[PDB]
Write a protein that binds this ligand. Structure first.
Ligand SMILES: CCCCCCCCCCCCCCCC(=O)O
Length: 279
């Protein structure tokens, strides 16, 4: 019927626009709106929870929901860094859809949370089908919490760690050495008294580069939260310049848009250092 075929076409429209995300924020926002349409949402500019009744968290939708989580994160991380309110709004949207991506991909997880099993323990049971969900949920949750402040961040630390621990168990190479890149940031951002460890950070960051030397986002995160922490101006400067100098064809085609964002982030950090007299 009209809506089951309008959801099949909007899924097609969503995927098409997400593949064209290198064109700019518009295509990203077009992808999100089509997915949300296919997920039964009324259209609009407010939080999903105000427009999306009973999103279908079924196995056949799990891939879509984890991709929606990544895409809303991509929008905020790429385009809202200058706008704290919007950035916080949209990272929380990605968290919201990420919770539904986890439920859809993992019946055991959905069952566990209904028997009052706490996330910390439930997340450890998610199978390979849920790795995209749990990785992009943790990415959105971490960046949302970080922007909110220390109280929110430390409140989420143990659930984040359990999530990334499970992702690393399932596949340390997922999304270009993602679980290792994530832990590099985790151990650099956390203060020592909250579990921070520069040795574990560098170890994880290096393992990520060994698995995916082309992933420029690893070096951006190193410069941003480690080189600053280590008060190593030379390394901060070097990492960012290596990012900016990297050739486009060094990374796989399917993440060219992400790498372009990371080069923009490096230029932005270069100008922040000058402006705020870092180092
Ligand atoms: C002090 C409390 C603990 C601190 C918790 C730190 C969590 C930070 C989240 C890091 C986000 C990195 C996401 C990388 C995504 C990608 O692969 O592009």
């Amino acid at each position: 019927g009209d809506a089951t075929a309008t959801s099949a076409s909007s899924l097609e429209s969503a995927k098409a626009a997400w593949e064209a995300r290198g064109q700019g924020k518009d295509k990203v926002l077009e992808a999100i709106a089509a997915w949300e349409q296919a997920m039964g949402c009324t259209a609009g500019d407010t939080s999903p929870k105000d427009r999306c009744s009973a999103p279908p968290t079924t196995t056949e939708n799990a891939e879509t929901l984890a991709l929606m989580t990544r895409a809303i994160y991509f929008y905020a991380d790429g385009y809202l860094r200058g706008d704290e309110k919007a950035y916080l709004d949209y990272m929380d949207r990605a968290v919201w859809w990420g919770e539904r991506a986890l439920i859809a991909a993992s019946p055991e997880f959905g069952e566990a949370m209904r028997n009052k099993t706490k996330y910390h323990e439930a997340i450890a049971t998610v199978g390979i089908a849920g790795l995209p969900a749990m990785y992009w949920y943790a990415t959105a949750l971490g960046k949302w919490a970080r922007a909110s402040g220390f109280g929110v961040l430390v409140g989420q630390k143990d659930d984040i760690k359990a999530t990334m621990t499970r992702a690393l168990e399932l596949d340390p190479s997922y999304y270009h050495g993602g679980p290792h890149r994530y832990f590099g940031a985790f151990y650099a951002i956390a203060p020592g008294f909250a579990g921070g460890d520069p040795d574990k950070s560098q170890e994880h960051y290096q393992k990520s580069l060994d698995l995916a030397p082309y992933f420029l986002g690893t070096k951006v995160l190193m410069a941003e939260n480690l080189a600053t922490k280590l008060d190593d101006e030379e390394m901060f400067d070097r990492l960012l310049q290596e990012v900016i100098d990297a050739d486009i064809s060094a990374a796989p085609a399917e993440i060219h848009a992400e790498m372009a964002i990371e080069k923009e982030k490096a230029v932005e950090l270069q100008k922040q250092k000058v402006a705020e007299d870092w180092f």
